[model samples]
Structure formats: C-alpha cells, structure tokens
Target: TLDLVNLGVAANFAILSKTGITDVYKSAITGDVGASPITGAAILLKSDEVTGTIFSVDAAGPACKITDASRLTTAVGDMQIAYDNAAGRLNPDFLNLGAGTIGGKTLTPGLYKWTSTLNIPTDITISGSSTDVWIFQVAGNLNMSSAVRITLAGGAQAKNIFWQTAGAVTLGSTSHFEGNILSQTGINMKTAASINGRMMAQTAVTLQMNTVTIPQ
Candidate 1:
C-alpha cells in the first residue's frame, strides 16, 4: 500500500454537482457540499446539517442552504478536475473481477476497472492499510443489491476508495456503502441507505432518508 502525493480526495469535495440539482430529505452530510449553475432552489436539502460549508452559484436565490455562493464556480471547476483525474487514471491492478460483478470477495488496495456494468449483489470487504488507496472505474452503471454492505478492515480508510462510474449509481435500500462515488449521471440512494463517503454526481444526486458521513 502506497500513498501518492499528487491527486487525492481532499483536493475535491464531499458532494459536487454540475446542474446543482441536489435533493436530500431526512439525511445527514458530514463534509462539504457544493453545486453550481442551477443554485438556490436547485439544491433542496433539509436535515441535520453539513459540517463543512455549502457552495452554490452567485445568482442563486434564496441561497438558504448555501454558505457563500462566491466560491461556487471554483469549487465546480475543482470537482470536474478531480473527477477527470480519477476517471482518466491509467493502468489497473485488477480488471473485470467476477466479470463486472464483485460479490463475496475481499479486495486490496489497487486500481480496478470494469468495461460493463458493475453490480454488488452481496457484501464486499476492502482490507488494507490506511494509506492504501483503491480506485474502481466502471464504464457503465453501478448497482448495489438490497441490504448489501461494504466493510473495511486492516485500517483501510474510506477516503482512499474511489468509485468512478460512467453511468448512474444506485444504492439499494438499507444498504451500507463506503468510498467516494463519482458518477457521470445521477446518484440515487434508496430509503435507509447509508454511506461513509462522498457522492459526487455529474448531474443530480437524489437521497431519501439516507445518511451520508464524509470520511474523517
């Protein structure tokens, strides 16, 4: 397990969207959240707060859920850059694990990619040192089955895991997930779904009675 100095999750944000259409209900976000272009009403969130500041466009009105819209543009740019860095990453330690379906397996730190859709039908374990990093590049959508889980062991850190999907991402009901998810389209978390990482969506991020805790 090795730590690279260049590109990391801390350089980006917890949640970022381009259309600024982010809706959360009865949810909790632990880190910074930002959206641009749409702004204000485009971000409909009401629940137990965000520990980090919120970002939105300047012209966005009400702007009630945002902290300062001034830095929204820069944040958006940073989000795109981060996404690109993760998606465009070259090389991989493992490709097409279980043929785009990884379940009931333990993974270590490395870059994994799948050319087709990725599905988690059961539980997945990620075991590694805290400094170890994992990047999963999915060419299609990512789907997690109901009540599935992703657990970490051996001091693995949630921030070091990145899930970059070219399509939408869906977290099934009552499922528990870990790692930062950067989706090309929207992200939907069903009821009781929980995450220990961030959800950075290209279009919209929809949450319903979900819990999102940014990695500490």
Candidate 2:
C-alpha cells in the first residue's frame, strides 16, 4: 500500500508534535502548531508568533499555550494517523539514492529508499512535472548542512514531496528545506532555517528562530 494518510485536522498544521514543541526567538510559522496526548506537553512559545490556530490536548493556560481542549485531541489523533500513513508508505524506487551523501544530485519524481544515514553536504535538486510525486524512506538520521538547499525545478512543488524518517531530523542554520518531514523521533531546525512544508514529529519539535511555511 502507498499509505495515503488523511491528515484531517492536521492538514493545515506546520508543526505537529505528540509530546511537546518549543520555539525560540521570533520564529514565524505560517501554519498551525500543536502538541497533544501529554499534560506536560508544553508548547513553549516564547517570542514566536504563529499565523494559524493552536491546538493542545491537555490543559489550557499560558504555560500550556494554545489549547482549545477540543481541537488538540482531534488534531493529535489525526496527526498520529498521518504519521502512521507516512511511515507505512511502501514501494520505493529501488533506492535511487546511495547511503552516504546526497549533494550535487538531481533526482526525478519517484520513491527513494535508504538503509543508512543521509546528509546533504551542499545542495541537491529534484526536478519533475507538477503532477509527479516523490517519497523518501530513510532508516537513519537525516542531516542537512548549513545553507544547504533542496532546489525544486521543472515545476516541482513541495506538496508533491514527502520525507519519512525512522530517526531524528536536523537542519543546520540557514538551511533551505523542502517537503514534509515525518520523523519517528525529534526534529530540530536551527537559526534561519526555512521549510516549505510541515514538520511532523512523534517526539519533540524544536525550532530556533526558523520559518515553516505550509505549502499549498
């Protein structure tokens, strides 16, 4: 199965965490943010500003941040479903990517599978038609160097790309990331890092003055 997940309430959310989420400085998130299923799942929103609704399944307070008491539960349920679906996506492109690095590579639209850790030492390109889709299944951590870029050409949009990681995800400072990130562990976005898609983490999500824009 392709594991097509129905995001439901989580569709508009840019940062979805099951445990907790933290935002530092004045990070700007262009979509919804939420944490659920735990009381101490504090959404540590310091000076950050979210341009969308907030959802928390636990208690509602300033410490707890945005919580409707209602929206969080539904959104969390839907988030879990989405994570499962993303992780369950089957059939890769027989592993177009190698095990070590992914810099200076131009990939077409297809599913890619990697059994080891991956990193973008410099930059990579993904070019294809707008109607095409790409899925990546990485069994280890994904690390992108500072100022690393994922350039989409030939009308390739972020909505058609999905990154499913079985380990943690880290984007260095000022890295330009594309596509949705469905990680089984934590996700840390460093300073000035920008994502054109969602960050869905099963554990914790931390952003340090980064930007997340929900792609259309």
List per-prediction Cα lDDT, in the order shown.
0.77, 0.80
Best by lDDT: 2
Candidate 2 — worst ten consecutive residues by lDDT sum?
A: 58-67
RMSD of 1: 2.4
TM-score result, candidate 2:
0.89
Which tens-of-lDDT digit does each residue in 40-65 have in candidate 1? 56776643456566666664533345
Residue-level lDDT of model 2, residues 108-209, one tens digit each, is: 877788888878889899898887777887888989999999999999888878888889999999999999888889999999999999888889999999
RMSD of each candidate relative to the true structure: 2.4, 2.4
lDDT of 2 at 118: 77
Q: Which ranges in model 1 have alpha carbons more than 4 Å from their true place?
A: 1-12, 21-24, 47-49, 59-63
Question: TM-scores of all models?
Answer: 0.89, 0.89
Model 2, residue 185: C-alpha shift (Å):
0.7
